[PDB]
Design a protein that fits this description.
Layout (H helix, E strand, L loop, with lengths): L37 E2 L6 E2 L7 E4 L4 E6 L2 H8 L6
Antiparallel strand pairs: 1-2, 3-4
PDB class: membrane protein
Keywords: membrane protein, FYVE domain, Zinc-finger
Assembly: monomeric
Length: about 80
């Protein structure tokens, strides 16, 4: 039977392949043997160490604890107002 109006076939955090992302999505820096490839838990794009040196939590993505992200994602989430 069809899933209907609702379906859990939905995916979160799209990871861009190493080959598709030969350069940093954030700073456009090229990945080399010495530079390990990484992914941001928000945008799901490939980020080098320098572009993934920041840390932040993502309560929208279900991440209540600070996790590794890139510069843009760190900011987008950062757009939210801190309770006080």
């Amino acid at each position: 039977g069809p899933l209907g109006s609702m379906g859990e076939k939905q995916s979160k955090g799209y990871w861009q392949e190493d080959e598709d992302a030969p350069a940093c999505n954030g700073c456009g820096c090229v990945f080399t043997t010495t530079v390990r490839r990484h992914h941001c838990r928000n945008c799901g794009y490939v980020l080098c160490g320098d572009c993934s040196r920041h840390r932040a939590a993502i309560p929208m993505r279900g991440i209540t604890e600070p996790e590794r992200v890139c510069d843009a994602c760190y900011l987008a989430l950062r757009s939210s107002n801190m309770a006080g």
